[PDB]
Amino acid sequence: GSSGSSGTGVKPYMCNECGKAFSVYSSLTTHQVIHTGEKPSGPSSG
Ligand SMILES: [Zn+2]
Numbered sequence: 484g485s486s487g488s489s490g491t492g493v494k495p496y497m498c499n500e501c502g503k504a505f506s507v508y509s510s511l512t513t514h515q516v517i518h519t520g521e522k523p524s525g526p527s528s529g
Contacts, residue, residue: 500529 485492485506494504496511500518505511520527 494506496505496508497503498505498511498515498518500515503514505514518529
């Protein structure tokens with residue numbers, strides 16, 4: 484999937500917490516979860 488020519492590429496759904504792009508809207512939201520962390524944790528990237 485996402486087979487094109489321009490390697491660089493580009494996607495509308497991009498995360499700001501870490502900086503990861505996606506080709507799906509839902510995927511972007513389901514991903515940001517890794518930053519939401521509703522429960523209290525220790526080791527966190529950002
Ligand atoms: Zn992210």
